Amino acid sequence: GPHMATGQDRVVALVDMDCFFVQVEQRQNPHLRNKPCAVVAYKSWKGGGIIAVSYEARAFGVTRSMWADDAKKLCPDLLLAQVRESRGKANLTKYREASVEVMEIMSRFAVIERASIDEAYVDLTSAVQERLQKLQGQPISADLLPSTYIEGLPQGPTVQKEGMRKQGLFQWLDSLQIDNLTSPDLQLTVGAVIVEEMRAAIERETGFQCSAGISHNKVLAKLACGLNKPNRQTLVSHGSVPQLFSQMPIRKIRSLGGKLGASVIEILGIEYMGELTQFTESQLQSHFGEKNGSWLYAMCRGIEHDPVKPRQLPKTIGCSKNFPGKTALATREQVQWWLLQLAQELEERLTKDRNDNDRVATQLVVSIRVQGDKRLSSLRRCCALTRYDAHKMSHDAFTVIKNCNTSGIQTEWSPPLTMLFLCATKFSAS
DNA sequence: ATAATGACGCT
DNA sequence: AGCGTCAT
Numbered sequence A: 001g002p003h004m005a006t007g008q009d010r011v012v013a014l015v016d017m018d019c020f021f022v023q024v025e026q027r028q029n030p031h032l033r034n035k036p037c038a039v040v041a042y043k044s045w046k047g048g049g050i051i052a053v054s055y056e057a058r059a060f061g062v063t064r065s066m067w068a069d070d071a072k073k074l075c076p077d078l079l080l081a082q083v084r085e086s087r088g089k090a091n092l093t094k095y096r097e098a099s100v101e102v103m104e105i106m107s108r109f110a111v112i113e114r115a116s117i118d119e120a121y122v123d124l125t126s127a128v129q130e131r132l133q134k135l136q137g138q139p140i141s142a143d144l145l146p147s148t149y150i151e152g153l154p155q156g157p158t159v160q161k162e163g164m165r166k167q168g169l170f171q172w173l174d175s176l177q178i179d180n181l182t183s184p185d186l187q188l189t190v191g192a193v194i195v196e197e198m199r200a201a202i203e204r205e206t207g208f209q210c211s212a213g214i215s216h217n218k219v220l221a222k223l224a225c226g227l228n229k230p231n232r233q234t235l236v237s238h239g240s241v242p243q244l245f246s247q248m249p250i251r252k253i254r255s256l257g258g259k260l261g262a263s264v265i266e267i268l269g270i271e272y273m274g275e276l277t278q279f280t281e282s283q284l285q286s287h288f289g290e291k292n293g294s295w296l297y298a299m300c301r302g303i304e305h306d307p308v309k310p311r312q313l314p315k316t317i318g319c320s321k322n323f324p325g326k327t328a329l330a331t332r333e334q335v336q337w338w339l340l341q342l343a344q345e346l347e348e349r350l351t352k353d354r355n356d357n358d359r360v361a362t363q364l365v366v367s368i369r370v371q372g373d374k375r376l377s378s379l380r381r382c383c384a385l386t387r388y389d390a391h392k393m394s395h396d397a398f399t400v401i402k403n404c405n406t407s408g409i410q411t412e413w414s415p416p417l418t419m420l421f422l423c424a425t426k427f428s429a430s
Numbered sequence B: 001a002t003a004a005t006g007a008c009g010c011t
Numbered sequence C: 001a002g003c004g005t006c007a008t
């Protein structure tokens, strides 16, 4: 009734770059602009695995996870860009540095939560209240929202894609309660005006294009972000959630794409997000635990309370390489060498981190995977990070895993390692 | 035999 | 402390 919290207290946006690693290479090499192209790591095996696909190549069916030699079967004119290699491994420095350019522009508008290398969450609540008071009381022109989609509109009593957008935008704006600085739909509209400005600044200042989702919480803005990619932004209001969730497959919601989402489907016998509304919170707490139960119950009414954390820098700095198949490390010296290669790149990035952000990692986590195991990591161990010295980090990382060699021979290493991963963490103000 | 990372929950 | 999940 009057005491049902509708999850409309905040304005939150999710900006995510369109085919990010591809845009970075396309800005650098103009010959790849507006062409089907992909980014690839390691051209030896089947031409390398594809990690990012432009939208022109997606049109032919090229996806990430594909081998470049298979993607050229689907698209013969596919242009490839290969990631820098340093010390025998992929090096993502170019994209990290591109990512920092974008984070700094978004930071100028609001406090952001770096959520990946190519996306950040924005909490625009206060900026919305600020803009609402300098607007005095003026209506909101559709000229302020040249790339916004209003999810669920048009509705009621034009055949092309941009025609629909306008007529949906017009309908929304025609309906807008301009008088009421408290109406949550007006605030989203104003959030969306700010996000247009911020997306323009990103494109003006980096040449990168991105999509954005604007809703009342992180989960809805993330889902909204995907609805009109690329180069568009989508407003999802509280009232569009019922129709939106009635055919929304469960797995498309953040944190439900895995086994939890699969057990919601199998146990509860449903397919779509909107179907969860029939269960009581207690029922959902019984099947999925108190925390998930409560979260599911509020979520399927479009209510979510996870806050935008004020974090623009990563909490961990990490460095890993896989060794699949016959290339799995099988001798002690081979393990030592790569641990040193990984420690060396970690050292350049730590030293850069300490001068740019004046903090220092204090703990070093070593994780490995053995051949024949099944999980991502097979063993995690940890020691102290006192000096930014690769040889010490290499030595210490080896020390705390060497007892895992079931090899009777000192020279050999079994079982063969298929993943080495080093991660500096527990950062303190420096 | 896509890889390379990063955040966070559970016990 | 060390493992498990979910993610881009």
Ligand SMILES: Nc1nc2c(ncn2[C@H]2C[C@H](O)[C@@H](COP(=O)(O)NP(=O)(O)OP(=O)(O)O)O2)c(=O)[nH]1
Pocket (backbone or CB within 6 Å): A016, A017, A018, A019, A020, A021, A022, A051, A052, A053, A064, A117, A118, A229, A230, B003, B004, C008
């Ligand atoms: N190495 C590696 N990189 C990945 C992986 N997944 C993503 N990346 C890297 C490369 C990706 O470019 C970058 C951004 O990831 P997204 O936002 O999920 N997809 P993008 O921005 O490319 O397309 P869209 O327009 O659909 O958002 O993360 C992966 O599994 N492995």
Ligand SMILES: [Mn+2]
Pocket (backbone or CB within 6 Å): A016, A017, A018, A019, A020, A118
């Ligand atoms: Mn992206």
Ligand SMILES: [Mn+2]
Pocket (backbone or CB within 6 Å): A016, A017, A116, A118, A119, C008
């Ligand atoms: Mn992303």
